[PDB]
Structure formats: structure tokens, C-alpha cells
């Protein structure tokens, strides 16, 4: 035995967050802890967000393990909300039905704040002459 599980990830900046979706009793846990407790605080619902736009009942038959690394306090949040919503559509993709899946996609991209497509923004190299990527040291002339 080995269960019918699926596996997706979600990256925001330098935060790659692996997810696992196996058929189960509907638990939703991030980093060994229930999703209720995601304590970057105000951005709480940012991780709830996928669990509401698509109907709370979809998850009752599936388990969610999400482990996170890298990035920062906000970037991990957007990286996990993305790993979740990407495994659900990848669960219906393989184990369920095409019609149901696009119904889930349609619920996201009509609202999409990244959700299931990676935000390609990254930091820009600094170059000699200043401290920022564009920012330049002050010059003084005469």
C-alpha cells in the first residue's frame, strides 16, 4: 500500500514550498502545524483564500502536507497559498475528472493573485557605482 497522493509546489521569490495531496479526512497542515495557525498574522486569510473561492467541501476527502523553505515571512505565505491551490487542480487532473478541474481553475484565475501561476519577479543585480541595482553614489563635481 502507498495511497493515491499527488504533489505540487509553489514559489514566490526565493520561497519554494512543496505540497502533497493524498486522499484522506480533509486535514490541511503547513510545517507540521494546522493551517489555522499560520502566524505571519494579517496575511492569515491569504492562505485561507484558496479554501473559500472553491468550496470548503472539496478538501474533506484529501490531505494536505505543505513544507516550506527559504524566502521570507511574506514570500513563504504566497508560496504556500500557491502550493495548495495547485495540488487541488492537480488532484482532479489525475484522480477525478476534467470538467471538475477546470471548474476549480475558473474559480482561481477569475480571482488569481498568483494562486497557480508563478510571479516571475526576482531581485536585480547591483553594479559598481552605487548601492542599489539602479541607485548611484552621490557625485559632487566642483
Amino acid at each position: 500500500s502507498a495511497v493515491p497522493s499527488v504533489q505540487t509546489f509553489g514559489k514566490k521569490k526565493s520561497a519554494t514550498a512543496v505540497a502533497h495531496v493524498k486522499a484522506g479526512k480533509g486535514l490541511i497542515k503547513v510545517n507540521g502545524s494546522p493551517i489555522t495557525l499560520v502566524e505571519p498574522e494579517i496575511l492569515r486569510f491569504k492562505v485561507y483564500e484558496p479554501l473559500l473561492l472553491v468550496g470548503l467541501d472539496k478538501f474533506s476527502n484529501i490531505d494536505i502536507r505543505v513544507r516550506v523553505t527559504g524566502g521570507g515571512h511574506v514570500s513563504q505565505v504566497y508560496a504556500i497559498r500557491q502550493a495548495i491551490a495547485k495540488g487541488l487542480v492537480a488532484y482532479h487532473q489525475k484522480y477525478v475528472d476534467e470538467q471538475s478541474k477546470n471548474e476549480l481553475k475558473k474559480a482561481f484565475t477569475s480571482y488569481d493573485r498568483t494562486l497557480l501561476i508563478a510571479d516571475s519577479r526576482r531581485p536585480e543585480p547591483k553594479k559598481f557605482g552605487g548601492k542599489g541595482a539602479r541607485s548611484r553614489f552621490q557625485k559632487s563635481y566642483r
Partner: peptide
């Protein structure tokens, strides 16, 4: 109000899945 292995509060389930306040 549906239930799953990891609770999820009632002020969460209701005031959300109905209307996106």
C-alpha cells in the same frame, strides 16, 4: 458547516464562503 480533520473556525467558514467580505 462541513467538518474536516483540521477544524477551521466558524467565523471563518460562514462569513467567507458565502460572501467574500
Amino acid at each position: 458547516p462541513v467538518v474536516l480533520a483540521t477544524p477551521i473556525p466558524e467565523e471563518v467558514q460562514q462569513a467567507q464562503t458565502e460572501i467574500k467580505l
